[model samples]
Target: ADNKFNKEQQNAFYEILHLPNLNEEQRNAFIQSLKDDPSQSANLLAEAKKLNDAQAPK
Candidate 1:
């Protein structure tokens, strides 16, 4: 399947990127880049998911 993030996933991604320790401007730029091209968004979301999952137990 083509790895592309839908709008909802993108929203979740932005939320994750905005976390306290994350670089805000960089995160915002990443999200904008994803919006400019949907294909890359899935990878971004996947990475974000991994990060979020890792923090879940903390």
Candidate 2:
């Protein structure tokens, strides 16, 4: 049950979450919590890095 989400999907998901009026502080706290948890952030950033690497075309 890999509920893992990719970078684009994650961002899109958050954006949608905000559409219902989720506040900035709440969003910041959520991101900060992710940062505080090394394992969680690492997993997310790993997926984000893949997208970043792919998009870094030269």
Highest lDDT model number: 1
Compared with the true structure, the alpha-carbon lDDT of candidate 1 equals: 0.59
lDDT of 2 by residue, 1-58 (tens): 1124456445544442343233455445544544455346554444444544554555
Error of 1 at 28 (Å): 0.9
The Cα error of candidate 2 at residue 55, in Å, is: 0.9
The lDDT values for all models are 0.59, 0.45
CA displacement after TM-score superposition, residue 33 of candidate 2 (Å): 9.1
Candidate 2 off by > 4 Å: 1-39
lDDT per residue for candidate 1 within 27-56, as digits (tens), equals 666566666766766677666556555655
Q: What is the number of backbone collisions in each predicted candidate, taken in the order shown?
A: 0, 0
RMSD of each: 6.5, 13.0
